Design an enzyme around this catalytic site. Structure first.
Site, PDB file in Angstrom:
ATOM      1  N   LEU A  12      -8.599 100.159 101.393  1.00 46.01           N
ATOM      2  CA  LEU A  12      -7.512 100.439 100.442  1.00 46.01           C
ATOM      3  C   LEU A  12      -6.680  99.202 100.147  1.00 46.01           C
ATOM      4  O   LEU A  12      -6.161  99.069  99.058  1.00 46.01           O
ATOM      5  CB  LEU A  12      -6.619 101.566 100.947  1.00 46.01           C
ATOM      6  N   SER A  14      -4.923  95.174 102.182  1.00 42.70           N
ATOM      7  CA  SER A  14      -4.615  94.406 103.367  1.00 42.70           C
ATOM      8  C   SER A  14      -3.503  93.399 103.088  1.00 42.70           C
ATOM      9  O   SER A  14      -3.274  93.017 101.941  1.00 42.70           O
ATOM     10  CB  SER A  14      -5.869  93.676 103.879  1.00 42.70           C
ATOM     11  N   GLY A  15      -2.823  92.963 104.143  1.00 42.70           N
ATOM     12  CA  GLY A  15      -1.696  92.031 104.005  1.00 42.70           C
ATOM     13  C   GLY A  15      -0.970  91.849 105.325  1.00 42.70           C
ATOM     14  O   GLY A  15      -1.596  91.914 106.390  1.00 42.70           O
ATOM     15  N   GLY A  18      -1.590  94.376 108.075  1.00 41.96           N
ATOM     16  CA  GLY A  18      -2.962  94.567 108.594  1.00 41.96           C
ATOM     17  C   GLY A  18      -3.936  95.058 107.524  1.00 41.96           C
ATOM     18  O   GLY A  18      -3.828  94.658 106.368  1.00 41.96           O
ATOM     19  N   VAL A  20      -5.968  98.531 105.832  1.00 38.83           N
ATOM     20  CA  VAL A  20      -5.953  99.982 105.730  1.00 38.83           C
ATOM     21  C   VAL A  20      -7.167 100.472 104.948  1.00 38.83           C
ATOM     22  O   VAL A  20      -7.418  99.996 103.835  1.00 38.83           O
ATOM     23  CB  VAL A  20      -4.660 100.494 105.034  1.00 38.83           C
ATOM     24  N   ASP A 135      12.221  98.039 105.395  1.00 34.07           N
ATOM     25  CA  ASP A 135      11.391  97.542 104.301  1.00 34.07           C
ATOM     26  C   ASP A 135      11.240  98.520 103.136  1.00 34.07           C
ATOM     27  O   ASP A 135      10.159  98.650 102.578  1.00 34.07           O
ATOM     28  CB  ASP A 135      10.019  97.104 104.812  1.00 34.07           C
TER      29      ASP A 135
HETATM   30  N1  LIG Z   1       1.216  98.717 104.525  1.00 34.44           N
HETATM   31  C1  LIG Z   1       0.818  99.953 104.731  1.00 34.44           C
HETATM   32  N2  LIG Z   1       1.012 100.677 105.846  1.00 34.44           N
HETATM   33  N3  LIG Z   1       0.564 101.842 105.801  1.00 34.44           N
HETATM   34  C2  LIG Z   1      -0.067 102.178 104.654  1.00 34.44           C
HETATM   35  C3  LIG Z   1      -0.621 103.408 104.340  1.00 34.44           C
HETATM   36  C4  LIG Z   1      -0.500 104.445 105.273  1.00 34.44           C
HETATM   37  C5  LIG Z   1      -1.008 105.710 104.999  1.00 34.44           C
HETATM   38  C6  LIG Z   1      -1.633 105.940 103.793  1.00 34.44           C
HETATM   39  N4  LIG Z   1      -2.190 107.034 103.296  1.00 34.44           N
HETATM   40  C7  LIG Z   1      -2.670 106.771 102.073  1.00 34.44           C
HETATM   41  C8  LIG Z   1      -2.429 105.492 101.771  1.00 34.44           C
HETATM   42  C9  LIG Z   1      -2.732 104.818 100.579  1.00 34.44           C
HETATM   43  C10 LIG Z   1      -3.382 105.477  99.530  1.00 34.44           C
HETATM   44  C11 LIG Z   1      -3.652 104.795  98.348  1.00 34.44           C
HETATM   45  C12 LIG Z   1      -3.253 103.466  98.217  1.00 34.44           C
HETATM   46  C13 LIG Z   1      -2.602 102.860  99.283  1.00 34.44           C
HETATM   47  N5  LIG Z   1      -2.232 101.585  99.191  1.00 34.44           N
HETATM   48  C14 LIG Z   1      -1.685 100.809 100.339  1.00 34.44           C
HETATM   49  C15 LIG Z   1      -1.136  99.470  99.830  1.00 34.44           C
HETATM   50  C16 LIG Z   1      -1.452  98.493 100.941  1.00 34.44           C
HETATM   51  C17 LIG Z   1      -2.862  98.914 101.334  1.00 34.44           C
HETATM   52  C18 LIG Z   1      -2.791 100.444 101.340  1.00 34.44           C
HETATM   53  N6  LIG Z   1      -2.361 103.536 100.417  1.00 34.44           N
HETATM   54  C19 LIG Z   1      -1.751 104.927 102.848  1.00 34.44           C
HETATM   55  C20 LIG Z   1      -1.242 103.655 103.114  1.00 34.44           C
HETATM   56  S1  LIG Z   1       0.029 100.831 103.591  1.00 34.44           S
END
Ligand SMILES: Nc1nnc(-c2ccc3[nH]cc(-c4cccc(NC5CCCC5)n4)c3c2)s1
Length: 273
Positions: A12, A14-15, A18, A20, A135
């Site tokens: 999905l 990264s940065g 970490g 995902v 944040d």
């Molecule tokens: N920095 C992040 N920490 N947790 C993240 C996170 C946690 C649970 C999640 N459930 C669904 C998502 C999700 C769904 C669609 C896009 C998306 N974008 C995020 C943007 C940074 C990478 C993932 N995240 C998600 C992201 S992103």
């Protein structure tokens, strides 16, 4: 234990947080997100009730987990030799608020009101449970597009809430308050309220109000889109230079611009479906 229990889908993103992955829990096809963080890249560690040494996000996510849908739920977590792996809820369909604002530009006030109200409820919940996110921004907010419900994500820059001063900060600079820029000192609630003013501006104008340190310090808000006076006033209040001049969460939710909020489902029907 994790390799077999979850089916791993595509990356999905990264940065600093970490990496995902989309994923599915094999037992019931429940959609999940699988978040990997390397041990070497964690500065801020915490401790569970029983004393195991974990990343702070895991402590903080455990403290806020409950039936309340405004914060992303931690379903499980695992230690590996060089990393931690977090299993988190994943709404489907979903879109993060940064992409949503990029695609639409400035949001209609009715929609910004509903979104902002839900962010406020979620931040209040965190604060009640002893958690400071540190944040808050569009990239850390997911929209459940069917239900019109927002969720806070990424507690990796967070801390336990306290009434004394913070002298560390690892969130996003352009959402950080002037007292951090000038003195490297802030208090939790008032800094959070500043980030919320930045977030609200972002929703109704389609971009953040300040780029450079000097603009943050000056705190002069210029509106690049048509925005009602009531919304402008609330925004300027959240972005007061003195921390003690900023509104409490209560004062934000009792502000005239915040009245008659749509329900999440009403919000989806009118604005998202
Ligand atoms: N920095 C992040 N920490 N947790 C993240 C996170 C946690 C649970 C999640 N459930 C669904 C998502 C999700 C769904 C669609 C896009 C998306 N974008 C995020 C943007 C940074 C990478 C993932 N995240 C998600 C992201 S992103």
């Amino acid at each position: 234990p994790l390799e077999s229990q979850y089916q791993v889908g595509p990356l999905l993103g990264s940065g600093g947080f970490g990496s995902v992955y989309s994923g599915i829990r094999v037992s019931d096809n429940l959609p999940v997100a699988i978040k990997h963080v390397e041990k070497d890249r964690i500065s801020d560690w915490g401790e569970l009730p029983n004393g195991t040494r974990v990343p702070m996000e895991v402590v903080l996510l455990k403290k806020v987990s409950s039936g309340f849908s405004g914060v992303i739920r931690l379903l499980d977590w695992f230690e590996r030799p060089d990393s931690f792996v977090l299993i988190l809820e994943r709404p489907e369909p979903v879109q993060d608020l940064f992409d949503f604002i990029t695609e639409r530009g400035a949001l209609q006030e009715e929609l910004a009101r509903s979104f902002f109200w839900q962010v406020l409820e979620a931040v209040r919940h965190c604060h009640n449970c002893g958690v400071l996110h540190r944040d808050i921004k569009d990239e850390n907010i997911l929209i459940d597009l069917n239900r019109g419900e927002l969720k806070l994500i990424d507690f990796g820059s967070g801390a336990l809430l306290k009434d004394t001063v913070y002298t560390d900060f690892d969130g996003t600079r352009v959402y950080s308050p002037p007292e951090w820029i000038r003195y490297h000192r802030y208090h939790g609630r008032s800094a959070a309220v500043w980030s919320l003013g930045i977030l609200l501006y972002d929703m109704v104008c389609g971009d953040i109000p300040f780029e450079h340190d000097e603009e943050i310090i000056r705190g002069q808000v210029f509106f690049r889109q048509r925005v009602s006076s009531e919304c402008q006033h609330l925004i300027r209040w959240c972005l007061a230079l003195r921390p003690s001049d900023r509104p409490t969460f209560e004062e934000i939710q009792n502000h005239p611009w915040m009245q008659d909020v749509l329900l999440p489902q009403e919000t989806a029907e009118i604005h998202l479906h």
